[PDB]
Amino acid sequence: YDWKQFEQNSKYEQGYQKSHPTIQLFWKAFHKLTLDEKKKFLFFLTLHIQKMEIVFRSPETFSPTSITCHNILSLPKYSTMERMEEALQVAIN
């Protein structure tokens, strides 16, 4: 249950750095949450986590006032039905 490791795992995309003032506010607000609140936050976002990674992005770098979560699919530009079919089967672990 190491929450420091969960923080260190975090990655930052456009608009943010680890040193950005809003990111430093988020992590202190997150660490002040009780354990049950932390879990409910991870449920809102998605245990044991210690290997989950969360990626931060500024709202203006997408297409506004509240926090939202997005499940992104990174899909390589496949040109065949057969390779696409095979790729889905591999994602189905």
Added chain:
Amino acid sequence: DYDWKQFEQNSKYEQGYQKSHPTIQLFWKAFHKLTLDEKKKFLFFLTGRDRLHARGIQKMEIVFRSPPTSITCHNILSLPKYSTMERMEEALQVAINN
């Protein structure tokens, strides 16, 4: 019955993709061919959610973006640039009380 066509319509397309891109049409053709258990297994991989009843997938939303020759997925947090601790704490409470 599961509302897979609505789930397809909820999709958004980001960096270098559109609903008419030929690879997207290849994806959905392949997606609508899996069994329900494979659709659910595929869903579990893209989110990790256990709530894949009919009402869950009907409101589910997937964002497509182009990249790595493997299919990968990420959870990204869209965080407004709040200025005060009091504002940040309030936004967390709104997020987990909904």
